[model samples]
Target chain A: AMEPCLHPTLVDETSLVLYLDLARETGYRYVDVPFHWLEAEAERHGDAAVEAMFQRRGLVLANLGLPLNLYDSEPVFLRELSLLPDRARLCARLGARSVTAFLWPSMDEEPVRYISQLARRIRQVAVELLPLGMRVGLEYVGPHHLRHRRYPFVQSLADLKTFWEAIGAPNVGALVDSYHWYTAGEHEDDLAQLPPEKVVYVHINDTRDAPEDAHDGKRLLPGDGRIPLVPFLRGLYLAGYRGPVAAEVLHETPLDGTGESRARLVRERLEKLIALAKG
Target chain B: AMEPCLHPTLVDETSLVLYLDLARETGYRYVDVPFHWLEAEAERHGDAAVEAMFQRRGLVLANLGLPLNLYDSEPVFLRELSLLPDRARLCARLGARSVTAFLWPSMDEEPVRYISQLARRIRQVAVELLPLGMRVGLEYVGPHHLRHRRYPFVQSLADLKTFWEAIGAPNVGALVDSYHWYTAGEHEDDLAQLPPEKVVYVHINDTRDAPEDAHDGKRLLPGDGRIPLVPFLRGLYLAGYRGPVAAEVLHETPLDGTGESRARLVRERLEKLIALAKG
Candidate 1:
């Protein structure tokens, strides 16, 4: 409850208890509070936003996701990163392990040079965040609503490996996502080959072999469909992903009502993998 | 309360509240408890089993479902139906509505004679239950469970219409399941042509065009795959389906923990359908 983002409304204790009970039933060790919600709650509760938000949103509110950057030309990006430490410490005080963020898109610059500038900026951001025992995960991909063609920070897994090596910061690394990796045509094997220690966090899902638009845009469970699942999951295991396997199956594609079925399909597959992994 | 097959452990007040709360949030109206659990509870609670079962199963405690044959062996089935009135009264006292059962699989019997007998048995069962203010429904095909082979009981809607009329029981009717009807090759137009009042329940799901076992053996969400869902749903709406749209998504085909995804998939699809249905 030490994170930012508390809503104006007084928290509903009954609702919060139910949420906590449900979270426990689901066997989750921590909670992921999207920054937008935290920001919303904080707007109402001021410095006590995290407390209000957690009691409202419920459960063991852990990692907080936010936008942090250090673009070379725009010192404003650095200012945002600098401001994150105090908030990050508050989150840490509430027992949250880390703060996750996106690597600002380096504009339309050349790939290698953009990455070099990114590396320099990340080095400074790490120095700023590390003191507060906070970690900044550079989400490798496009900025905001945009995806780049082949930028160094937001390209394929191989590119992420190269970029992380170049940046060489203890706190900065790629935010690995299965769906994104699959969509970018980076097979599970490519992700698996990374040095185990390099992978800081993970986002998980199953998908078919298709682009975003043509995708019935619903995801399958981890082992459900034709996503070449076993190898992909094995890759995560090899990469030593210890983060929460959030089943982020956001079925944006509207099919008569396929969203639910699609999620169930994906969940079923994940459960299969989980069982196999337990062995 | 009435369903002797539901688990008794769900009878506690807290458990009942939790079940109802989950049901509401999840948008699921009908939930099935394991028959074994119910049987065990029945043994422990004795004559007070219905009331205890209701409290234990976290249901208003009325309805019961069993796979029992009524046509050839009317005595046992009718006896069970006869017991339902008292249960219905008990359920009414407990703020419950109705209970139902699936038609016994006459897959091995001759079609015309078997269906005629089936209709007669239903009429008798309804006569027994209706006076007690109870209703009974026949769930046909069940898609994956029963491999119907040219039986009019499932292949053609006209057969069901004829049977419903022949039975002529106000409280006895068919449960319209989208997956079964679709898989049985009943088209949207065919479904639209059916008498609306005869449909007592609805189970919705989407599947691949070719239900080949080799391909994943998984059903997709309503919109996630290639099922002519919109027209199918529209047909149900046009047919005047006033009954509850129960999500009978039995995801545990493999029963290897792979079924949870199906539950999630149903939830997601149901949400979308609610939005579309509102539209």
Candidate 2:
């Protein structure tokens, strides 16, 4: 619907109507919708109802967020892995081109060994999902604590490249986030160097500082904090990343107002940053 | 006293007498005892009494295990830093030539920033201790999980060197551990490349196998596991590392039993490995 798709979080604590109204007011033609919503809604109102809800708002399901936990005991992890096909089908049906999941590590293990295991799992899921016309985008966590606990490996673009190559599947790609990129101490050149086709989706946010232990409370809107989001976005665009650019400002006070006010503030902030990238 | 140093866990449940007695029975002239014991004992038995305990057992305090938590809140971390001078003095008084600590990380922050903070702290502590004749040895953790919690930054030999150089203090040195070395996927050649003077202290243990998530429970007595201890020890020796080669087999089943039997078994295993290095 636009040159660079603008999207917003679907995990916010607002009603479906309010979310769609906000998207429409903020000029976002694309929106992120987690898959669990469909699972719950499909059981209640049916899949057709869920699909119509977005179509009526003139919003395309740009990306789907359904975290796949790959670091668990054999039976528990495999049980989750076995359901990938059904979830992929759901994503396709919901009109999402890609599904996002994090590549995490087991804290007590070697990262090398964990990356190997993650690669195998990625390939296993990608093989099934690719035939169904859905791409798998792996997300990297940057917060030092989260990296230690939930997501250990794939914390940087270099780590992401290593994992993507290990998977070696055409359908496997990266879900690049500006917050992670900033917190990982990555340069704009690092993002610019990535092959454009590899970045399936992008998350935009800012940070006040680069300390590894800095928590989520420090996250800010793209233009409000210290991260150079203009250069980051430009690098992504140059690398051929024309995917949905989503606002992921977590724990920011400005993002906590009424739906209309929040939408207006986000629109003003994000549009200005997008213009900066264009320049 | 001869070649191997029996290093007990600084945070283990065993009594001080049991630890030193085990060292004596195992033909170990040098042993590791933390300053925490001295802090408690000095209050009850007097500081002079604490020093006499090692002398009575014919065990030299090869190195004092006082792991300082360098990663913390400003006031909290600074409070810990203030005590280093007194602690280093106590280490010198207890007949230890060096004080060992691990420069760890807080998981949620950036490693680059954390390393910078660590380098500054190392400089702060070393400046005071070096004049007191107590060299500081920085321990690097190898396990992915442990690195996330208590010790986050210096996980490899290369990282240890980076921190040591960043501090730029002559007395700051590496505390090399065979378990961490192997798990970090470092080769025997890495150990051999270091100048002997740079490697201030050593911890030796063997892993049964190397996986990303290999636990401490998988640790084995030297020469009883899959690690190439022969080459590892030889590398240290060739590099001119004539320091104490301490046994640090954590959470291993074979390390249990009566202190006498445990000491005898560790002595037997360590001596054979040491002999192999000599050849």
Candidate 3:
């Protein structure tokens, strides 16, 4: 069964203990780390001390969002990469061994050069993270509006696979986002073809029937809108995906409740989606 | 006073009569037409019959969104342009003299050639509308995220003004959208200097604080989020912008109610915003 991971982004919490507690109480077996928060938390005490906090709560670590802005200047990303070794070591202690990041759909430079540059940078990061027993999942940002850049790049599951192959790293895997899958104009067969072993993480969110504008910020709760969630979930389950599947809904504008209450709602939605797929 | 026109987009009604009745009963002095619906309604009946519908409802015709896609292939847009003469004639009868369209922020072409081509096309649009005593308002799409195109174009109120000047037509004016204004990184001073006579229409919508990602689809009710609506409204008010200031909020995700209920909620919010500006 896909793990019911409580994506930490759904809640805004300053304290790691409080967020972990929220996940524990909400019945999420895995809680995604707010990477910066965990780094600071671990820095305040030590790695095991932070690990003990999750251990005490009976919560497993799901994964972390790539803490580096891969689109930024080389020096900037380089410094962010330096900080990740400490993070990998900490996640290693807590049973979390993966990081997920989206491949930017467009850039100002020529597509060939941009991909070449990105490929080099990613390969560097992959080699560094590899020995630490950490896998990095590359997600495609699929929105037609976003592809307006000077150069459009990886944006479909196919594009992601191509980019991943070009990166040429054994540790590189795929991260499938349901919203992107729908927006990318991908169907069941498109998703079905992705090798199950390569899918390191999954994000589940529904979308409105007719999006007035195709934007990434626009997302819905699972099963809330037009997405065929049953088939999406069933495909992942049948593919033997045992990874953390979290709700990455961006419902900030009409946010209806307190962070705790929102977490409860998200957890309930997540369970119902899973249960419906299995049944 | 800045007219608190009820933007028709807040509702999703098939019947023009039901929509106009909702706008009238909700206490809106002006109601934006669902342009395609108006044309179809006018096609079914004579223009006077359609004009009488609004006259009887005690609702003024605010304006029409440009019924043509300025971005399509020449023939497609040209065909759409052919339909506009009938539209402008109809609007002229309804005491509605203006139309609004957004300037594309990015395109897959060289910026210089793109603008030259766009300017020529807009000049043609301006001249055609001029004899009919019609004004075409050019709205700049603001969000940094939207500018990822190979060629980025007009995107600020400042940019709109520049493009308006370039078009070099007295009938060409500006349509200001509050969400775009905020996302464009504009301020009080940005709105302060615009000549009041050149302002054609206004779109009022609020935005959430700390938008995780900047995308046009994410918007809130006029006062529902963190946008400085009072100052924005007051600026237009003080500038002598008496045009229809409608709530152009795109809240479809958790679309909470029926079109009528949503219209009522939008009307209540729009009124409160205008009232607060004057108060």
Q: RMSD of each candidate?
A: 27.2, 17.8, 21.9
Summarize candidate 1's per-residue lDDT along A75-142 as a digit string, tens digits: 68767876766666455434344455555333567766776776777776665554343455555642
TM-score per model (chain B): 0.66, 0.86, 0.92
Candidate 3 CAPRI category:
incorrect
Residues B144-220 of candidate 1 have per-residue lDDT tens digits of 34554544354335555556687786656566666667665667777676544345456565665554221223444
Q: Which docking category, incorrect, acceptable, medium or high, applies to candidate 2?
A: incorrect
Off by over 4 Å in 3: A1-279
Q: Each candidate's DockQ score against the native complex?
A: 0.01, 0.02, 0.01
Mind giving the per-residue lDDT tens digits that candidate 2 earns over B1-279? 226776664224367776777777668777776667667777788868878988888767778775467667778777877877777676677667787786542355533334445555666777777688777787877776665553345568876765454465788788887878888888888988887767788888776676456564456667667778888888888888776788777774545565566556766777788788878
Model 1 is docked with a DockQ of 0.01
DockQ ranking, high to low? 2, 3, 1
Per-residue CA lDDT of candidate 2, range A122-211, in tens?
A: 667777777787788888767776654533445677766655545657887788888888778888788788876678788887767764
Q: Which candidate, 1 or 3, has the higher TM-score? A: 3
Candidate with the greatest DockQ versus the true structure: 2
lDDT of 3 by residue, B54-94 (tens): 88888788888888777678899788787778778888777
Candidate 3: tens digits of C-alpha lDDT, residues A9-118: 67776677788889888777788776787879877997778888888989888887777777788789889889877777777678787887887777776333355456
- Give the DockQ-based CAPRI class for model 1: incorrect
